A paper describes a structure:
Pol α is composed of Pol1, Pol12, Primase 1 (Pri1), and Pri2. Pol1 and Pri1 contain the DNA polymerase and RNA primase activities, respectively. Here we report the cryo-EM analysis of yeast Pol α in the apo, primer initiation, primer elongation, RNA primer hand-off from Pri1 to Pol1, and DNA extension states, revealing a series of very large movements.
The significant conformational variability limited the achieved resolution of the EM map to 5.6 Å, insufficient to resolve the bound template ssDNA. Transitioning from the apo state, the ssDNA template bound form of Pol1-core (i.e., state III) drops down 45 Å from the Pol12–Pol1-CTD platform and rotates 69° for binding the template DNA. Accompanying the Pol1-core movement, the Pri2-CTD rotates 92° clockwise toward the Pri1 active site for binding the template DNA, and the Pri2-NTD shifts 22 Å outwards accordingly. Therefore, both Pri1 and Pol1-core engage the template DNA, but their catalytic sites are ~49.5 Å apart. (2) In the template-bound primer initiation state, the Pri1 captures a template DNA thereby triggering a major conformational change that leads to the release of Pol1-core from the platform and the binding of the Pol1-core to the template DNA at a position that is 50 Å upstream of Pri1 (diagram 2).
Numbering used by the authors:
A (entry chain A): 6 to 53, 60 to 90, 103 to 390
B (entry chain 1): 349 to 548, 553 to 593, 607 to 676, 681 to 815, 859 to 882, 903 to 1055, 1273 to 1288, 1290 to 1418, ...
C (entry chain C): 248 to 318, 320 to 386, 392 to 580, 606 to 672, 689 to 705
D (entry chain B): 42 to 67, 72 to 174, 180 to 202, 223 to 250, 254 to 282, 288 to 299, 317 to 348, 352 to 381, ...
Write the structure that this text describes.
């Protein structure tokens, strides 16, 4: 049991490592302290608020020594008017489709679910909403938080936030024991998302995760995606007679058995319907599975970038295209680097601070 | 070591202060009487904010207005969240109130109370307006009956010649007084009084005083305890001419000496038989009649004059004048409740029942002339008085009237005097007042075996969690009482010392009586906590249990001889004490198995029972229709000219619908379709024309005019000043109904189902299925063509 | 529109008649509204007042006189009615429903004394441009008939056939205007249902609508296609299903009459034939208008002149209200809510006004308007009735009265 | 103002049959016109609270417009009545935030109904009194526009103006723009403007300082026993009318009180228990022929017969909850369509276990368990 960071490790982290100036400049939307910071809510979670300057923010967090803090709305008075539009994505809703990790483990293989979720959400935020100023942040374990800082995104009402969420949240029913039966024809966003996800389905789902090699798991999550009972009963019999066929073999058996069953002038309707079921299953397995609550209301609190995760010791760092959870620096490793070189600029944290600074510099230019 | 300590016994109200009477210990370990005057007491008022308003809003309105009326410089007030759970419908379960402390002593209008229904735009109710001062003190300071009181800041020089007490002090604020935990109490000075009267007005002939100066309730009182002093006073009943006997020439002299003796004796308790509502009244009125100046020594406050209205209020005056001395009456309601084996509660009877001693009462009549010259008669009469006096005392001690009432008072938190001289209601009231107030609630403003089922209701309230708030307050209170009673009975089984054991038995009894009286709180109609829905709820469950208790008895092959909510009598079917008791216990166990909180017991064992009623027995004890109602008929004329109403394919003496059409019965000629339809159409048009004539009629039955004149205010009647409403006399509803009726005549489905309106009443001189079906189909074409002529105008409407 | 009668709406219409005349009087005589006051209450001062002539009791005797009449709008006098004192006025003609304007005084509270009658002004006449009149130029004959067309004791249209032959081959008019009733619902054989078998019809009619198609249509069809023929109904027409005045036009297709030369018009209707404006109405105002009259000069005039002037002044073809009743059998059958449609279209007086009556046929010029009653085409007994022939010589006032000759011809 | 200048002002303010009520109008009329508009707005709110479709609401309000507030007339007086009633209600509803929000909601819905009742020509004239895309931009986006619209010229607008169409994926989205909905844009602008004008009206209201404004603002505002009648054991025996009345009484705390009071008397609720029942329920016998004869229930009423008074949609949902099959529901609805309400009710009795009295329905239901 790798114990999480001690209280003294958190004191050291806030004293010497946490990028208070960059987080303040991000949330203040200006080089000069403003009401975007003075009237911003912070919540502190302890092992058992609002700030006027970088110095006040640092001194209050150092004095309080919280295990984390969470960023809220800008208010009309010092602690809702504005807040960054936020999305949260965790691995939990992908647990039924991964074999490389169990329970609360993560690796570069299942991280591809989060990478695809970020890619599809980014496509919608950029191309459909016209947003420019967003950043992804590692949740410190097995998820990622998006922060959309465009002025138009900050000023969204709860009704508009709900409409943005309902546009991106295609998979509303997360139950894998049932066919999604998505609306046809697909909305342009959903059609585009399918074409972006299709190239990854064979390599991730059929080969790297191979979740349906297990015949009970194939009965529980592959068969319920099909529309036809005679096809389901025929596949179930065929896999009972021929156990432990790979996900790739079972994927082809679906088409072979369907072609044997559906003959004559109605066959084309069954072929179209089977293709639609396979497409709905590509989306069920790989499409973004957002936490819906954090996005809906302007007042929702979300964990600050660069917080420490209390169980893993990982820093909640900004994400680039190369990111995997094993690249997130741990507080204990950063302390060991600081013992050799008593300067944060010489630690594994500095590249992530530089990435975040470049983002904040772009945002302030757009503002 | 720096505080004045007093054991309080009684109280009285005067000039918006509260006086407590009690005992103080002196340096020689002896205890004397004392009084404490308490100033600074306030009424606790709670103002209930209006929808949208706050307590601060209330503070702004009434506080300044209250300063004016009462003439106060400042009034302590503050917001406070309080719970409400009683019978006023418009008050919420919980709210923020403005708690205002209004002193009882105010410079102005101190006798004027704030009504609960005070008009205001910030609040719509006010609790605590009519608070009683004793109640306020006891509830605010958590005083639970007679106990030791630590009193700080006692002023020993303020009070002058106010009482008949040895020690007089005062305090500026009630918070200076707190109760201590000390369980022991000082000895009490008891004085037994026996009075012999004479009917002239009831006049007093003699008085016997027996003093017991060291009655300790901390240990059992020894049987046949002898008085430290015994004295008898007497005046001559007609003319002017053991222990001490004192003779006086008249009644005024006698009563004067009596009062003087009372003052010097300074008893804490006055014991007697039927004092409360017989002899104390006679004593009071005679002292009044004879203008005895020292009359106040019957109590402990000094007055030179009687109340103005003295001469129902008489009860209060006397009780008030006696304040300071507890009235221990063995034959009042409380006394009777401890002696249920009595029937008359006559002195000799009580003596027999409680002490198993016989005294044959002499009927003394001082009207008889023999008492003026016969010295032996006078002496025997005085002996009777002396005997009665000492009997009354002995009985009061044997039935443990003081200890039991004290324990009951400590449990309910009321006044000892109220327990001794009141009904159950008082105890029931205060036990709840203390309970609720302490948990942030606002209280309302002021062989046959006899099986005991007294615990029925308190077990129901506890089992089914019945409360004003619903575990609720009342059930929790009962549970605690039952639990503590068990704790006591557990300690008894082990206790060896007879003193402590007897004490436990008293404690145990008091706890039982308290619990078994709780129902009165919500059941008694005139109770401060009366709640009919709760009473009914508890009563109904009580019936069920009793009804089922019967079935249970029968399941053991027992017979219920009699029963009610207090007791159930069962025929055991045995002729042996042992067998009877076993059956009795078996039934006891059975009842408890079905009702875990109901523990009944065997109260009476009847070897034989001659029964007539509960307390009357001898025994050996062991120890379309409406739519067309006003339409008019379609009248056809025969192309022979006879006229007749046409009612469809129905019977008629004038016409027949035959297989080849409508036929006239007078001349046998058949109508052609045009001969029928031209007439249908002609009638329709006559109706439509009448309708367009536009006659109007007035509503008002005393006017009724019909006219075609229409005022430029259409509905207005043209009769000077008539207020009726004008309506088209042929309404468009009536026209439409008339046409729908015509339509029905030529409707095949309606003809076949025989649903048309009759053309003739039974008494009409022209009163007239398978034929109708057939004839209707044979004439379908005629019908439909007749019908189309009506429809020409129905679609156009 | 359906058969609804709504009292509020009827009263609205009656109110509006008083108010619109109040504005016509004020513009014509150039008076200010402050000169008008409530005649139902006492004043010291003479006032102008406008109102409707009504009886002085709502349950009144059949026969009225100058001592038994009353006169306000809702704004004028809260709709109150006040008895008229006409003793200071020597010459007058009033009728029930007439809108009138007075100068007078209510001296004591219970009567309004009329000092003078302000006559309502005659409506303007239509005009035409020189271009329009030249097109019309590039004599006009109009024939007018009015039902009944068959007698009371038979179903002969022999006289109508004779007439049709005459107009087709001799008279050759440009337009023929025919007023109902065609099949009169109060014809006594129709009323009693004494309708015979017709041997000249292969299939007998089953309804009065079918009786029209078999009896009238084939004869009407023989009118020359060169003669435009206009049909205007009566509220007594069995063939109409709208038995109130104003009355919707008949439906030509339903009557199976040819489009080539038949037009069905409303009752009333107004139209032009070339420049000439016709106003046609088929309720018998001339029979029904019962004047209350004072004065030798008024009484020595011809009744038909006085009645025509009342109609022109009132600017509506049947100004009597309540409308007359035939006692129930028939009547004016006014649909009060739609009296609006019976007002002179555009506020214009017609050049020719045709209002058939059961009185003797007549043609008269009154206030430069040609007023024509053609009389009934056939008499009840079966004797010849009459019809009217109008011959008219071929911005500008039409002066039809100067150019028109009207003959009343035995049919 | 001479009556002619006033007429010219109203001719200019009403070139369209619809108005945003931008300019102020230049006692019996004041009160009647306010009451007549207020009745229409309360009927709108009553229909909205009952989740009626826009087309059902349009059908109910159409006869009320002809009676109380004629729209689409050339009458100057009807146009005046519409203006003045709107501005008079601004004075009534400006006083509290809740009154403003209710008025803006009802008035914006009234605007939507009236706009839908206009001709396409009158709608276009009103809009003239929303940029279309070029044919090139349409050609570039043609595939994505067609895919979006297939299930259902293009207008390009910020997506924030069509959030309701975005949530349903009825509009195409690119770069923060929606490719379309004009009525929703106009309704939001109307609602925003009206809310701003109500705030301004409230700021000036102290200078106007009343009985009519106060009144109009306020116009918007035993086995069988008092407890057992609310229990499933007893209530499972009630017919639908008694169910309706009940659910109401519970939700909201004359005709309905009489129908329910007399029914409860008929089932054996004593006088004393009935007074407890009503006192407790106010927290803040007729046969079917008689019930049906009473004035029809309106918004806020629960008397009458649900088989006549409820839509087939509402009845079907209720009958589905009662476990009735589709064939059974069709049979009940067929009776309703025929006006045979007691037959429909008898069918429900039989299918859930001729009756023409609610007390007989209850008694028969109880007899089946005894
Ligand atoms: S038919 Fe009668 S009992 Fe049934 S719901 Fe209707 S009114 Fe009630």
């Amino acid at each position: 049991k790798t114990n999480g960071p001690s209280s003294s490790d958190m004191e050291y982290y806030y004293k010497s490592l946490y990028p208070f100036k960059h987080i303040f400049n991000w949330l203040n939307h200006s080089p000069k302290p403003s009401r975007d910071m003075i009237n911003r809510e912070f919540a502190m979670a302890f092992r058992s608020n609002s700030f006027n300057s970088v110095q006040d923010f640092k001194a209050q967090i150092e004095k309080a020594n919280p295990d984390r803090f969470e960023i809220g709305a800008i208010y009309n008075k010092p602690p809702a008017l504005e807040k960054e539009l936020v999305f949260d994505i965790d691995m939990d809703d992908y647990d039924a489709f991964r074999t490389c990790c169990s329970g609360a483990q993560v690796c570069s293989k299942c991280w591809k679910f989060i990478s695809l979720a970020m890619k599809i959400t980014n496509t919608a935020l950029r191309e459909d909403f016209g947003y420019k100023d967003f950043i992804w942040v590692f949740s410190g374990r097995r998820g990622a938080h998006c922060w959309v800082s465009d002025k138009r995104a900050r000023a969204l009402t709860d009704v508009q936030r709900r409409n943005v969420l309902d546009y991106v949240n295609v998979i509303r029913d997360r139950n894998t024991d049932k066919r999604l039966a998505l609306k046809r024809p697909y909305h342009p966003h959903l059609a585009r998302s399918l074409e972006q996800l299709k190239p990854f389905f064979v390599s991730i789902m059929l080969e790297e995760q191979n979740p349906w090699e297990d015949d009970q798991h194939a009965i529980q999550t592959l068969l319920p995606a099909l529309y036809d009972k005679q096809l389901i009963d025929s596949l179930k019999k065929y896999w009972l007679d021929n156990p432990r066929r790979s996900s790739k073999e079972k994927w082809n058996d679906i088409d072979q058995i369907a072609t044997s069953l559906f003959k004559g002038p109605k066959q084309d309707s069954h072929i179209i319907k089977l293709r639609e079921c396979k497409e709905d299953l590509v989306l069920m397995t790989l499409y973004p599975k957002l936490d819906v609550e954090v996005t809906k209301q302007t007042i929702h609190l979300l964990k600050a970038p660069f917080c420490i995760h209390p169980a893993t010791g990982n820093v909640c760092v900004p994400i680039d295209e190369s990111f995997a959870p094993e690249k997130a620096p741990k507080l204990i490793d950063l302390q060991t680097e600081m013992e050799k070189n008593n300067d944060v600029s010489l630690t594994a944290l500095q590249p992530f601070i530089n990435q975040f600074q470049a983002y904040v510099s772009s945002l302030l230019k757009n503002e | 070591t720096d505080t004045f300590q007093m054991f309080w016994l009684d109280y009285c109200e005067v000039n918006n202060t509260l006086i407590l009477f009690g005992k103080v210990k002196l340096k020689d370990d002896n205890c004397v009487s004392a009084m404490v005057q308490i100033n600074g007491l306030c009424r606790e008022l709670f103002f209930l904010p209006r929808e949208g308003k706050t307590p601060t809003d209330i503070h702004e309105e009434i506080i300044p207005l209250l300063m004016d009326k009462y003439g106060l410089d400042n009034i302590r007030a503050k917001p406070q969240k309080m719970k409400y759970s009683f019978e006023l419908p418009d008050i919420p379960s919980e709210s923020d109130y403005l708690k205002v402390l209004l002193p009882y002593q105010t410079p102005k209008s101190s006798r004027d109370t704030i009504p609960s229904d005070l008009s205001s735009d910030t609040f719509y109710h006010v609790f605590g307006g009519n608070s009683n001062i004793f109640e306020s003190f006891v509830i605010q300071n958590r005083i639970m009956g007679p106990c030791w009181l630590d009193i700080k800041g006692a002023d020993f020089n303020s009070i002058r010649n106010a009482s008949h007490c040895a020690v007089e002090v005062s305090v500026d604020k009630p918070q200076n007084i707190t109760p201590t935990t000390t369980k022991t109490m000082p000895n009490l000075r008891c004085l037994s009084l026996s009075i012999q009267t004479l009917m002239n007005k009831q006049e007093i002939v003699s008085i016997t005083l027996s003093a017991y100066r060291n009655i300790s309730l901390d240990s059992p009182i020894p049987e046949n305890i002898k008085p430290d002093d015994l004295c008898t006073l007497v005046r001559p009943p007609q003319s002017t001419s053991p222990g001490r006997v004192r003779l006086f020439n008249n009644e005024k002299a006698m009563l004067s000496c009596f009062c003087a003796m009372l003052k010097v004796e300074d008893p804490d308790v006055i014991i007697g038989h039927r004092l409360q509502n017989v002899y104390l009244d006679v004593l009071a009125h005679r002292m009044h009649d004879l203008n005895i100046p020292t009359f106040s020594s019957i109590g402990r406050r000094l007055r030179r004059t009687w109340p103005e209205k003295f001469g129902n209020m008489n009860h209060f005056f006397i009780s008030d004048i006696c304040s300071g001395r507890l009235i221990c009456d063995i034959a009042n309601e409380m006394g009777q409740s401890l002696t249920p084996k009595c029937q008359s509660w006559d002195l000799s009877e009580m003596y027999q029942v409680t002490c198993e001693k016989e005294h044959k009462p002499l009927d003394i009549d001082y009207q008889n002339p023999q008492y003026q010259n016969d010295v032996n008669s006078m002496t025997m009469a005085l002996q009777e008085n002396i005997t009665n006096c000492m009997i009354s005392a002995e009985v009061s001690y044997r039935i443990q009237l003081l200890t039991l009432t004290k324990q009951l008072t400590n449990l309910a938190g009321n006044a000892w005097a109220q327990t001794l001289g009141g009904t159950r209601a008082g105890r029931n009231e205060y036990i709840l007042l203390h309970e609720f107030s302490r948990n942030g609630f606002i209280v309302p403003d002021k062989y046959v075996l006899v099986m005991d089922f007294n615990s029925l209701y308190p077990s129901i309230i506890q089992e089914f969690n019945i409360c004003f708030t619903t575990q609720g307050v009342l059930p929790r209170l009962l549970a605690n009482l039952v639990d503590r009673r068990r704790e006591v009975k557990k300690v008894m089984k082990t206790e060896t010392d007879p003193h402590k054991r007897v004490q436990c038995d008293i404690r145990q009894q008091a706890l039982k009586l308290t619990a078994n009286s709780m129902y009165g709180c919500l059941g008694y109609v005139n109770s401060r906590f009366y709640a009919k829905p709760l009473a009914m709820l508890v009563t109904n469950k009580g019936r069920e249990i009793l009804m089922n208790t019967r079935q249970l008895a029968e399941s053991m092959n027992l017979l219920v001889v009699y029963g009610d909510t207090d007791s159930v009598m069962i025929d055991t079917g045995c002729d042996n004490y042992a067998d009877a008791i076993k059956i009795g216990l078996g039934f006891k166990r059975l009842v408890n198995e079905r009702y875990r909180l109901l523990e009944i017991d065997i109260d009476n064992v009847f070897k034989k029972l001659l029964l007539h009623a509960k307390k009357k027995y001898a025994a050996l004890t062991v120890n379309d229709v409406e739519r067309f109602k006003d339409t008019v008929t379609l009248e056809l004329s025969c192309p022979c000219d006879k006229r007749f109403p046409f009612g469809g394919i129905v019977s008629s003496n004038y016409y027949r619908v035959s297989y080849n059409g409508l036929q006239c019965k007078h001349c046998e000629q058949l109508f052609t379709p045009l001969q029928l339809t031209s007439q249908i159409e002609h009638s329709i048009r006559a109706h439509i024309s009448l309708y367009y004539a536009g006659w109007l009629q007035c509503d008002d039955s005393t006017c009724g005019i019909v006219t075609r004149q229409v005022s430029v205010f259409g509905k207005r009647c043209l009769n000077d000043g008539c207020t009726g409403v004008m309506r088209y006399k042929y309404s468009d509803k009536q026209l439409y109904n008339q046409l729908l009726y015509f339509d029905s005549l030529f409707d095949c489905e309606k003809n076949k189902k025989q649903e048309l309106k009759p053309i003739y009443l039974p008494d009409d001189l022209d009163y007239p299925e398978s034929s109708i079906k057939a004839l209707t189909e044979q004439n379908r074409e005629l019908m439909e063509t007749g019908r189309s002529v009506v429809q020409k105008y129905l679609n156009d409407c | 529109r359906t058969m609804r009668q709504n009292l509020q709406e009827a009263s609205d219409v009656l109110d509006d008649q008083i108010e619109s005349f109040t504005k016509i009087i004020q513009n014509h005589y150039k008076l200010s509204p402050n000169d008008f006051a409530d005649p139902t209450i006492q004043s010291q001062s003479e006032i102008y007042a406008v109102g409707r002539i009504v009886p002085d009791s709502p349950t009144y005797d059949k026969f009225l006189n100058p001592e038994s009449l009353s006169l306000t709008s809702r704004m004028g006098g809260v709709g109150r009615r006040v008895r008229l004192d006409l003793s200071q006025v020597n010459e007058l003609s009033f009728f029930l429903g007439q809108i009138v304007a007075f100068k007078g005084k209510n001296a004591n509270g219970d009567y309004f004394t009329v000092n003078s009658i302000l006559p309502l002004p005659y409506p303007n006449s239509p005009v035409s441009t020189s271009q329009e009149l030249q097109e019309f130029q590039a004599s006009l004959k109009v024939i007018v008939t009015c039902g009944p067309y068959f007698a009371n004791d038979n179903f002969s249209l022999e006289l109508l056939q004779e007439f049709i032959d005459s107009i087709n081959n001799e008279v050759k008019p440009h337009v023929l205007i025919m007023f109902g009733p065609f099949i009169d619902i109060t014809h006594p054989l129709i009323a009693s249902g004494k309708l015979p078998n017709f041997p000249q019809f292969k299939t007998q009619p089953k309804t009065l609508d079918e009786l029209f198609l078999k009896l009238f249509t084939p004869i009407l069809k023989t009118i020359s296609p060169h003669i435009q023929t206009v049909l205007i109904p009566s509220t007594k027409d069995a063939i109409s299903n709208h038995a109130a005045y104003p009355q919707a036009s008949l439906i030509r297709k339903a009557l199976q009459l040819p489009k080539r030369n038949f037009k069905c018009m409303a009752n009333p209707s107004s139209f032009q034939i070339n420049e000439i404006y016709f106003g046609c109405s088929n309720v018998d105002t001339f029979k029904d208008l019962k004047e209350v009259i004072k004065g030798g000069t008024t009484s020595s005039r011809y009744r038909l002149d006085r009645v025509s002037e009342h109609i022109l002044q009132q600017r509506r073809y049947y100004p009597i209200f309540p409308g007359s009743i035939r006692t129930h059998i028939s009547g004016a059958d006014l649909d009060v809510s739609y009296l609006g449609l019976t007002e002179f279209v555009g506020g214009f007086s017609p050049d020719i006004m045709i209002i058939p009556s059961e009185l003797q046929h007549f043609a008269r010029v009154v206030q430069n308007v040609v007023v024509i009653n053609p009389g009934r085409f056939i008499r009840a007994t079966g004797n010849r009735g009459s019809y009217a022939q109008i011959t008219v010589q071929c911005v500008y006032l039409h002066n039809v009265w100067k150019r028109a000759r009207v003959d009343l011809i035995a049919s | 103002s001479s009556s002619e200048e006033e007429k010219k002002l109203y001719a200019r303010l009403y070139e369209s049959k619809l108005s945003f009520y931008d300019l102020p109008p230049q006692l019996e009329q004041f009160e009647i016109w306010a009451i007549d508009r207020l009745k229409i707005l309360l009927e709108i709110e009553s229909c909205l609270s009952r989740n009626k479709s826009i087309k059902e609401i349009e059908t109910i309000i159409k006869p009320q417009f002809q009676k109380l507030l004629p729209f689409n007339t050339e009458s100057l007086e009807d146009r005046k009545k519409d203006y003045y009633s709107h501005f008079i209600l601004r004075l009534c509803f400006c006083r509290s935030k809740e009154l403003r929000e209710k008025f803006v909601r009802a008035e914006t819905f009234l605007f939507k109904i009236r706009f839908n009742m206009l001709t396409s020509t009158d709608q276009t004239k009103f809009v003239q009194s929303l940029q279309f895309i070029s044919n090139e931009e349409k050609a570039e986006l043609s595939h994505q526009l067609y895919q979006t619209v297939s299930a259902s010229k293009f207008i390009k607008l910020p997506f924030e103006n069509v959030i309701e169409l975005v949530g349903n994926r009825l509009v195409f989205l690119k770069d923060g723009y929606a490719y379309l909905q004009q009525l929703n844009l106009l309704s939001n602008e109307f609602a925003s403007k009206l809310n701003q004008e109500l705030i301004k009206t409230y700021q000036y209201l102290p200078r106007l300082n009343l009985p009519i404004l106060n009144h109009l603002s306020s116009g918007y505002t035993d086995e069988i026993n008092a407890q057992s009648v609310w229990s499933e054991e007893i209530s499972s025996n009630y017919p639908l009318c008694i169910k309706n009345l009940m659910e109401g009484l519970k939700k909201n705390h004359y005709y309905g009180r009489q129908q329910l009071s007399l029914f409860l008397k008929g089932i054996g609720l004593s006088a004393d228990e009935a007074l407890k029942f009503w006192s407790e329920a106010f927290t803040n016998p007729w046969d079917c022929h008689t019930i049906l004869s009473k004035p029809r229930p309106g918004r806020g009423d629960y008397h009458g017969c649900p088989f006549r008074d409820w839509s087939h949609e509402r009845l079907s949902a209720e009958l589905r909850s009662m476990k009735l099959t589709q064939a059974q529901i069709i049979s009940v609805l067929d009776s309703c369509q025929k006006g045979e309400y007691t037959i429909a009710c008898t069918k429900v009795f039989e299918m859930t276990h001729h009756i023409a009295h609610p007390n007989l329905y209850f008694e028969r239901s109880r007899q089946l368990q005894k």
